[PDB]
Design a protein around this ligand. Sequence first.
Ligand SMILES: COC(=O)[C@H](Cc1ccccc1)OP(=O)([O-])[C@@H]1Cc2ccc3cccc(c3c2)CC(=O)N[C@@H](C(C)C)C(=O)N1
Ligand SMILES: COC(=O)[C@H](Cc1ccccc1)OP(=O)([O-])[C@@H]1Cc2ccc3cccc(c3c2)CC(=O)N[C@@H](C(C)C)C(=O)N1
Ligand SMILES: *[C@H]1O[C@H](CO)[C@@H](O)[C@H](O)[C@@H]1O
Ligand SMILES: *[C@H]1O[C@H](CO)[C@@H](O)[C@H](O)[C@@H]1O
Ligand SMILES: *[C@H]1O[C@H](CO)[C@@H](O)[C@H](O)[C@@H]1O
Ligand SMILES: *[C@H]1O[C@H](CO)[C@@H](O)[C@H](O)[C@@H]1O
Lengths: 323, 323
Amino acid sequence: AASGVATNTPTANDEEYITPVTIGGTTLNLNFDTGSADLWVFSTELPASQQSGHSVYNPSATGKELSGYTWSISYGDGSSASGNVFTDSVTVGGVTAHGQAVQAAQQISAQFQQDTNNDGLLGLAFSSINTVQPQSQTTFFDTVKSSLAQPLFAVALKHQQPGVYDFGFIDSSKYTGSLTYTGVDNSQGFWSFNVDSYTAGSQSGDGFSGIADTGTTLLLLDDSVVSQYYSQVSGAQQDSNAGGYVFDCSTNLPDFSVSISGYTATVPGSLINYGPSGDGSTCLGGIQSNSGIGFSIFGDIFLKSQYVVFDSDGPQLGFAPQA
Amino acid sequence: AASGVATNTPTANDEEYITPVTIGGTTLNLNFDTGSADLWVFSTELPASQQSGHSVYNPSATGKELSGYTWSISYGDGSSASGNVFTDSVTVGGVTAHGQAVQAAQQISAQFQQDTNNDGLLGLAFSSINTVQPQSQTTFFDTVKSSLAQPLFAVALKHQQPGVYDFGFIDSSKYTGSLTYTGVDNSQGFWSFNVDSYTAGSQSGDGFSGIADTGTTLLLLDDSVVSQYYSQVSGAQQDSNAGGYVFDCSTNLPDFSVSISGYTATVPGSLINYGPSGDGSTCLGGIQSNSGIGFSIFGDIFLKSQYVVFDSDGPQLGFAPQA
Ligand SMILES: COC(=O)[C@H](Cc1ccccc1)OP(=O)([O-])[C@@H]1Cc2ccc3cccc(c3c2)CC(=O)N[C@@H](C(C)C)C(=O)N1
Ligand SMILES: COC(=O)[C@H](Cc1ccccc1)OP(=O)([O-])[C@@H]1Cc2ccc3cccc(c3c2)CC(=O)N[C@@H](C(C)C)C(=O)N1
Ligand SMILES: *[C@H]1O[C@H](CO)[C@@H](O)[C@H](O)[C@@H]1O
Ligand SMILES: *[C@H]1O[C@H](CO)[C@@H](O)[C@H](O)[C@@H]1O
Ligand SMILES: *[C@H]1O[C@H](CO)[C@@H](O)[C@H](O)[C@@H]1O
Ligand SMILES: *[C@H]1O[C@H](CO)[C@@H](O)[C@H](O)[C@@H]1O
């Protein structure tokens, strides 16, 4: 049976985490995203000017084209990308998926062009939400899942240090104590789970649902919860240039936690100071608005505090404090 | 319980069929498409120049916005469209879906801009393939299905005459004899069914699968089957300007049939003469290539010969010769 450890590395301020992936023999630095079921890459089909500053997939040499197939993704921030599809060999952490669908980019919007830190995204959400037309494809994980020793992956994202994606086994040295599991609702293709309550500093409130999403930088919560959190942060104010609420970098931030199946997942206030806001001399808050969507996005700020097991058996998520 | 009859009308040469749909009180002429799960419309969010020659949805007056939601579709011909989403009242054949998701167009490609015959598409495929992000929406049919007298719809497309979409009941006067049912595989979100064999004129061959797709003008089959068909048509030759194989308009075309669960669905040769090719003095063939996709597209050319029941119970498709 297979397993492997793929090492991830955060970019500045942990805006994203990149992990190398060898496709048809070329290694690309991809953003692993548990909130997406697409594996899309910068490719030789983009205009040459858009290829600059990236490693790019060249399908002509090794890929098998799925003639007539397309893909396209659109985000609420206004970003988008689209293209065609080839199958190829895709290796992550020493685990190879043969015949894996690779969505080659033909078009990408400004946000993607501007980020030279990654060459695309590798999706780890459920395959039911893969965007390939006319017949959807399986994610890297779903492709290799039955070959793994256990049909799961796990992740340790860290603050300014390398982390791991463990495929096919659990590394118990990556957390303190025992894992606590909770059921996953995959009906929207996400690793969605329920929280029974939250505590934002001095205030506690009702539970809600959310999704474990490595592809989102911050922890996105309902506006009401965000307001209660920042009401406790002296001088906090919104700055749309920065991304939301910002505050003096020396501020002592409250912790934020959620109760999941009896386990308290605590994000220490230190991890809620994302870093320099990039708009003068303030720091950006790790907690921000989910913009009214009615469910929470447990992005990197939250994940940095935990080791999280994504188990297809259930399916279910396991959590414990990161060690 | 509800039911209703929506009348469809073919454009020139039956290139598509349009059916009126009232959205937030504005009536738009939509292309009903059993091969899509999206209900997308030209809207006031398009550039004004792109709105010309169309009726357009104005969400400001009646729609409820799903903030942060997007949609985007990409086709193998290179067409595409994308936008945002609102829920609104959508009435088809006197049957109203309250709170139906309406995908307002913000961007549309040339093929859509150029066709002033429709104001968008109303999808009737399974909701599992709806493209709305971050949470997919239900089609008009899935929205109203449990309110209907029976959870099915049926369609009679005709050559140069008005036809119907029957919602919630079967009109037995629309076909000869009794319906024959066959099981549907909805795993790719399509009304996919199996054929046991086909007969292209003087040649018969092995079975295959395909999808009942009102949104495709022609009958698309494997290249091998297309070649065998046209090998029997004197003077047939491909013309990429026209869309594929063309031939003298007076040619006597062979029939084409498929065996489905013991019922023979025959498309008479008369219906295989699509019409003027629009490239000099030849006519376009109703049968063309599926471009290597490995499954057949039972588009309008085929559907014009049958009455077809799309029954969610099973699910299953019923067929009989159109009356
Ligand atoms: C449809 O599912 C998504 O798009 C999934 C899950 C989701 C669902 C709803 C709300 C938010 C997230 O997002 P994702 O694939 O992880 C998606 C990945 C992604 C795509 C383009 C981006 C462009 C600029 C910046 C970021 C991007 C991230 C950083 C960022 O965290 N952006 C968030 C937004 C929400 C601040 C984001 O769009 N993240
Ligand atoms: C993902 O599902 C589709 O796109 C579904 C089903 C499908 C699947 C695979 C092959 C063909 C069809 O197609 P549809 O929604 O019915 C889709 C609807 C559609 C969309 C844009 C179009 C632009 C120009 C011309 C047509 C269009 C039809 C006429 C035409 O028949 N076009 C075919 C091609 C195939 C000749 C077509 O793209 N049709
Ligand atoms: C992950 O687990 C597999 C199977 O148990 C090992 O073979 C592999 O080397 C790694 O430790
Ligand atoms: C990626 O790199 C890390 C850190 O060197 C290793 O621990 C991991 O196994 C993988 O090689
Ligand atoms: C369709 O069927 C319904 C329910 O049987 C009728 O009420 C309707 O008027 C139409 O004939
Ligand atoms: C659409 O129009 C047809 C033809 O007039 C009717 O038969 C149908 O019931 C609907 O009104």
